[PDB]
Amino acid sequence: HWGYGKHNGPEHWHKDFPIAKGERQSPVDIDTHTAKYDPSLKPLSVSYDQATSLRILNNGHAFNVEFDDSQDKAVLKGGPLDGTYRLIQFHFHWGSLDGQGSEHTVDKKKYAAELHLVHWNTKYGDFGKAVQQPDGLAVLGIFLKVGSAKPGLQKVVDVLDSIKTKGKSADFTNFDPRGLLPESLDYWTYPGSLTTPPLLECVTWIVLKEPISVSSEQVLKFRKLNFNGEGEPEELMVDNWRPAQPLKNRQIKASFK
Ligand SMILES: NS(=O)(=O)c1ccc(N2CCCCS2(=O)=O)cc1
Numbered sequence: 001h002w003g004y005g006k007h008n009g010p011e012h013w014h015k016d017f018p019i020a021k022g023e024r025q026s027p028v029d030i031d032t033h034t035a036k037y038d039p040s041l042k043p044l045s046v047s048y049d050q051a052t053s054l055r056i057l058n059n060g061h062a063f064n065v066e067f068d069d070s071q072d073k074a075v076l077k078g079g080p081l082d083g084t085y086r087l088i089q090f091h092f093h094w095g096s097l098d099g100q101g102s103e104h105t106v107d108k109k110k111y112a113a114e115l116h117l118v119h120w121n122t123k124y125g126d127f128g129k130a131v132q133q134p135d136g137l138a139v140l141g142i143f144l145k146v147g148s149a150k151p152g153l154q155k156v157v158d159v160l161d162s163i164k165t166k167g168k169s170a171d172f173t174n175f176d177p178r179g180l181l182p183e184s185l186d187y188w189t190y191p192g193s194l195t196t197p198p199l200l201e202c203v204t205w206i207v208l209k210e211p212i213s214v215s216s217e218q219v220l221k222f223r224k225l226n227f228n229g230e231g232e233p234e235e236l237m238v239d240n241w242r243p244a245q246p247l248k249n250r251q252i253k254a255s256f257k
């Protein structure tokens with residue numbers, strides 16, 4: 001099955017998921033000089049004060065911090081979005097080295113990691129139905145660079161010992177996603193896709209201009225995770241990012257002048 005290795009990685013995905021070569025695939029390079037400021041964009045609203053985290057899961061390609069999405073408790077609205085999108089989970093993509101790891105690039109620059117806060121359009125009733133829709137999802141993407149520690153990340157870092165291998169999960173209640181956000185909500189936005197199989201073209205991407213900083217030791221613990229299940233040969237969970245895909249005649253919009 002699909003992975004990030006030489007034999008099952010991004011170059012292979014198209015054979016099982018033909019949409020890999022579609023018209024609105026993600027991630028993309030954000031060419032900052034080609035991006036246009038959009039005055040019709042409303043202010044971005046991130047409402048995570050009532051957020052209810054439940055669990056953290058190693059799914060064999062990254063780890064998901066899952067939330068209770070049965071009521072409007074953590075929501076994303078405004079910006080390019082019509083209606084309300086509920087937070088279901090967040091996860092990261094990272095590299096084997098600090099000079100790579102992000103999925104989106106900015107003027108071809110790769111960051112050490114990228115955080116994805118995944119949201120589904122409430123008019124569609126659940127996540128499964130939302131991913132059948134062109135505007136089913138909204139993913140808020142945040143770049144990670146190496147520098148000072150992110151205090152709001154440490155609770156995540158510390159539990160990774162407990163979910164080392166594929167299929168392992170751990171209780172992860174009372175985690176506050178607000179501690180993962182940068183100061184500014186300035187962003188780029190474009191229509192795109194899931195960056196992993198099934199690569200469904202359902203996402204409004206909202207990628208924040210301001211990266212967060214994480215410490216070397218925080219990122220190092222990400223790299224100690226395993227792609228494999230327990231009792232199988234160890235394959236370090238690193239370089240779980242898809243490279244930039246063709247923009248194809250889509251326009252990236254900026255929230256800022
Ligand atoms: N990387 S991404 O586009 O934000 C992304 C968001 C959600 C998902 N998933 C959809 C398939 C089932 C659960 S999931 O987390 O793996 C995969 C990728």
Ligand SMILES: [Hg+2]
Nearest residue numbers: 132133201202
């Ligand atoms: Hg879709």
Ligand SMILES: [Zn+2]
Nearest residue numbers: 092093116195
């Ligand atoms: Zn992702």
